[PDB]
A paper describes a structure:
Among the known FcγRs, FcγRI is the only receptor with high affinity to bind selective subclasses of IgG in monomeric form (1–4). All known Fcγ receptors recognize the lower hinge region of IgG with their receptor D2 domain. In the case of FcγRI, the lower hinge of IgG-Fc A chain, referred to as hinge A region, forms primarily hydrogen bond interactions with residues on strand C and C’ of FcγRI, while the lower hinge of IgG-Fc B chain, referred to as hinge B region, forms mainly hydrophobic interactions that include the “WPW” sandwich between Pro 329 of Fc and Trp 104, Trp 127 of the receptor. Unique to the high affinity FcγRI is the presence of three consecutive positively charged residues 173-175 in its FG-loop, which are not observed in the low affinity FcγRII and FcγRIII receptors.
Since Arg is the second abundant amino acid at the FG-loop position 174 and is observed in bovine and ovine FcγRI sequences, we generated a H174R mutant of human FcγRI. Indeed, the H174R variant of FcγRI bound to all IgG isotypes with similar affinity as the wildtype receptor. We subsequently crystallized the bovine FG-loop variant of FcγRI in complex with human IgG1-Fc in three different salt conditions at neutral pH. The current bovine FG-loop variant and Fc complex was crystallized in 20% PEG3350 with 0.2 M of different salts at pH 6.6-7.5. All three crystal forms belonged to the same crystallographic lattice with similar unit cell dimensions and their structures were determined by molecular replacement to high resolutions between 2.3 and 2.5Å, respectively. The three complex structures were nearly identical with root-mean-square (rms) deviations of 0.2-0.25 Å among them. The overall docking of FcγRI H174R variant receptor on Fc closely resembles those previously observed in which the D2 domain of FcγRI is wedged into the horseshoe opening of Fc to induce a conformational change in Fc from a symmetric to asymmetric dimer. All three structures crystallized at neutral pH with different salts contain well-defined electron densities at the interface between the receptor FG-loop and Fc. Arg 174 on the receptor FG-loop forms two contacts with the B-chain of Fc, including a salt bridge to Asp 265 and a hydrogen-bond to the hydroxyl group of the second N-acetylglucosamine (GlcNAc labeled as residue NAG502) on the glycan associated with Asn 297 on the Fc.
Residue numbers in the entry:
A (entry chain C): 19 to 280
B (entry chain A): 232 to 445
C (entry chain B): 231 to 445
């Protein structure tokens, strides 16, 4: 059986003291009339409904939540922090894989008003809003990893504490090989490769490769990793480029141009 | 009432030396910060004593390190207009503003007063050291806009500091300028000049000299 | 109609330089809380000297300001050498309009202290045509900028003087001038005037230089 999955409503992993949040224990097997096991830092919680509602958060609510229903595996932990302060930088997740969107919010204590908000990554403000606004980055990549905070103008300028967000890489730049020899006697068997491999344990994820010449195509998105023209006439000579991407295309990377001489 | 938000405006006067030398170009500088990418267009209207002028030069948008834009408009001014107390108004319009922002600047009001300029040799106690301090006392001037320089034999001196103007009990200002020179240059009898530029001086300047003499 | 975020703000002030340099005086650290609301006026202070908590503080009574807020002040006497040695003083402010207590710390300005050089400069010959006359005290080469300069004559304080702010010099030390204005009759009658300087880098924290018509 697959694992349970916890979802936060609102999705923010950091809240203010006395704020409200609801934890949803989702199991793909949709059960009926079956209890839910909730855990705070390994300790069982005296609540068995499929959702767990914190009505007024305090320090005692902080830690790792995990949940389990039916014959499911226990869920991966979600970490909820409860903070005091003027401004709180809220994020939708602390860890992500490239391609997965990241949501950010500059939350004012007791929902008061700030304006002229700045969002910072690693000390530098990268986004400015006259009116307080959430911010979403759809196509995340490794460079979006860093320490996030925000500031805004209320009666005075206030600044949030930092929070760390990691965007994990999926595969490096798919470098293109050179089979043996350049230059070459035309009438020699080709073999060309695209050098990239997965960095995370993605059990059934498949990468799709496609080899280029100058710009016009040779072979489109295919599950095989090697382009093999039967035996080379140097019409297939010069600019060689590879591209490796996920099936959805939301993570795609380049490679150096291959010196090809047949 | 969520009027709050939008760009801010800062209006800066000319450098004192630029208003006093007909050679140089005095400018008033209107700076707009916190311009967003969503509403990047900034419009400047300039008025001199209420009557609009159209000769200002606007530099293009410049992205700041906090990812906001900064836009600057530079208005060249006539020396006598500024010195006669004409008012300079900058009016800034931008879609993120509920109404234009207006800033007005002018020379400080009040009857100008001529500075008295006195040069003071180093204290005898200082002659035991390798470098001595040459002192220029400038007092009794109004307004506080002034410029002070040191030179010797037609060349600028590379090593002097000047205090800010300080308010005196009579409503006028005073300051001091400290020129530091090698003891040998002072004892060898070189002449050093303190040049003071202020609107209330004849030809907008005076200069007094200082040299070792027993 | 949501209101702007914000509450009380805290400003934390160092002792007067002269108070820390004279054992006969009492140096104090001052914790000023502004924008205290009428609805929540209760303010609580906690003081900490180099981490350790102290209880010798004194909090003045509130005072309304024209913007219809309160301004509570808490004064903490400090030990001279504790301040001169660089210990840090922390003020902790608590109020219901705050999400958490505000903390501010101060300490002596860090950096290698440099001894002031003090020079008195008589009036320029060309000023001797005026009714009043300028006596000049040059203090240069000192660090930090915390300093105190005064004038006296015949045991009595001369108070008709102005002193410029410290100015950063091109060698990283500070300087200033102090200008004492006196009637030209007093100067030419031979009366002696003295510039008194107090700074942490001087021997005994004090030096003085005198000035009078030489011949
Ligand atoms: C996003 O970034 C921007 C950009 O900032 C830069 O980048 C960021 C990322 C940071 O790295 C930052 O540190 C960088 O500077 C931020 O923009 C800043 O915004 C703040 C306000 O939020 C502005 O603060 C005001 O500054 C005034 C002084 O500015 C000068 O001095 C500073 C250094 O001291 C310089 O950095 C400035 O650029 C200004 O420099 C002057 O520029 C003039 C124009 O070019 C020069 O004159 C011209 O010079 C040329 C020569 O080249 C010719 O000679 C021309 O002829 C001549 O005209 C001038 O030489 C130069 N001076 C110096 C020393 O270099 C302050 O005056 C002002 O204070 C007033 O307003 C405050 C209200 O906010 C108030 O609190 C103050 O009390 C004061 O109020 C005044 O009080 C007096 C009484 O004393 C009254 O009489 C007045 O009426 C009253 N005035 C007003 C208007 O109320 C501000 O502190 C800052 O200037 C600005 N920086 C820049 C570069 O534009 C932005 O804030 C960031 N956004 C966010 C959300 O974070
Ligand atoms: C509502 O009203 C109140 C009341 O205000 C007053 O009342 C009415 C009548 C009004 O008309 C108003 O004009 C009046 O001022 C408002 O309260 C004010 O709030 C503002 C902020 O909003 C405060 O501004 C800060 O001021 C600091 C320095 O203030 C001193 O100097 C001014 C005059 O220059 C005085 O008015 C102050 O009272 C302070 O004066 C000091 O008073 C002390 C008394 O406790 C003295 O210490 C003690 O003195 C006794 C003797 O009595 C013994 O000697 C003790 O031993 C000794 O300890 C002290 O000597 C005396 N000094 C002087 C010189 O007189 C500024 O430092 C501060 O600026 C910092 O912060 C800014 C933003 O926060 C920032 O922009 C600055 O850059 C600066 O940041 C600092 O920068 C330096 C570098 O320069 C760095 O090294 C620092 O690390 C850095 N620090 C920080 C934290 O950033 C502010 O400008 C104002 O002081 C305060 N007034 C009073 C009276 O308390 C209130 O704001 C109003 N509300 C609204 C919404 O308007
Ligand atoms: Mg005088």
């Amino acid at each position: 059986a697959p694992k349970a999955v916890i979802k936060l409503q609102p999705p923010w992993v950091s809240v203010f003291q006395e704020e409200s949040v609801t934890l949803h224990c989702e199991v793909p097997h949709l059960p009926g009339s079956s209890s839910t096991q909730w855990f705070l830092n390994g300790t069982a919680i005296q609540t068995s409904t499929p959702t767990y509602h914190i009505t007024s958060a305090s320090e005692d609510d902080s830690g790792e939540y995990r949940c389990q229903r039916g014959l499911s595996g226990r869920s991966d932990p979600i970490q909820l922090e409860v903070h005091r302060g003027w401004l709180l930088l809220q994020v939708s997740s602390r860890v992500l894989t490239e391609g997965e969107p990241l949501a950010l919010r500059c939350h004012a204590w007791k929902d008061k008003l700030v304006y002229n908000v700045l969002y910072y990554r690693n000390g530098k403000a990268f986004k400015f809003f006259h009116w307080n606004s959430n911010l979403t980055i759809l196509k995340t990549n490794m460079s979006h990893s860093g320490t996030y905070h925000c500031s805004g103008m209320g009666k005075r300028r206030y600044t949030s504490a930092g929070i760390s967000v990691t965007v994990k890489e999926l595969f490096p730049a798919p470098v293109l090989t050179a089979s043996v020899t350049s230059p070459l006697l035309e009438g020699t068997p080709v073999t060309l490769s695209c050098e990239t491999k997965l960095l995370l344990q993605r059990p059934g994820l498949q990468l799709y490769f496609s080899f280029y010449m100058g710009s016009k195509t040779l072979r489109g998105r295919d599950t095989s990793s090697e382009y093999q023209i039967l035996t080379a006439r140097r019409e297939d000579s010069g600019l060689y480029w590879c591209e490796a991407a996920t099936e959805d295309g939301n993570v795609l990377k380049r490679s150096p141009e291959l010196e090809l001489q047949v | 009432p969520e009027l709050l938000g939008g760009p801010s405006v800062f209006l800066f006067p000319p450098k004192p030396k630029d208003t006093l030398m007909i050679s140089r170009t005095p400018e008033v500088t209107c700076v707009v910060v916190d311009v967003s990418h969503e509403d990047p267009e900034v419009k400047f209207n300039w008025y001199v004593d209420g009557v609009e002028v159209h000769n200002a030069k606007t530099k293009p948008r410049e992205e700041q390190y906090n990812s906001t834009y900064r836009v600057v408009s530079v208005l060249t001014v006539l020396h006598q207009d500024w010195l006669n107390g004409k008012e300079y108004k900058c009016k800034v319009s931008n879609k993120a503003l509920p109404a234009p922002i207006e800033k007005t600047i002018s020379k400080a009001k009040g009857q100008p007063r001529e500075p008295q300029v006195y040069t003071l040799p180093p204290s005898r106690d200082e002659l035991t050291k390798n470098q001595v301090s040459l002192t220029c006392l400038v007092k009794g001037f109004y307004p506080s806009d002034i410029a002070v320089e040191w030179e010797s034999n037609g060349q600028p001196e590379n090593n002097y500091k000047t205090t800010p103007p300080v308010l005196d009990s009579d409503g006028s200002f005073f300051l001091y300028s400290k020129l530091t020179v090698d003891k040998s240059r002072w004892q060898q009898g070189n002449v050093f000049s303190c040049s003071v530029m202020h609107e209330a001086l004849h030809n907008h300047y005076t200069q007094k000299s200082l040299s070792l003499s027993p």
